[PDB]
Amino acid sequence: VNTAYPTPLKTILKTTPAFVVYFVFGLGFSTVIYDVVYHPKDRIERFYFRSSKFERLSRKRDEKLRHYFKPAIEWQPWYNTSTNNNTRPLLRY
């Protein structure tokens, strides 16, 4: 009762370890990319251009308010640095 592998399958299996190593490396690379892009945001944030206009506005409203509105409304003549190293305009001209 020689329950050996079929000849074609046995021939095919020779290159399988290369496939396994490739899968190991590819999974490592994909997981590293996923973790690198996941940790800063605590999630896989959808691409900005992959969203509606209203969704984009809602997403960026908080950032605009925190970065521009508050300094703009709390501005004082002596807050600006004398070295002219100020934040760039949102729409650079």
């Binding site: 800063p40 984009r56 950032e63 605009k64 305009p89």
Partner: protein
Amino acid sequence: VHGEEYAQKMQKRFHQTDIWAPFRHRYAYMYNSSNKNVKDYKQVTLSRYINGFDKFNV
């Protein structure tokens, strides 16, 4: 300081005020006239790899 009339003339921009035309140095074009990165260059560079830059708008 120069005069109330002078200040009023300086501030006035349109004869007819029925139309609102905000002043802009330039008009946004990319991303359907929006800003993808409302941040500094340093923040834009770092936030893609460092935690704490995103404020979790939820």
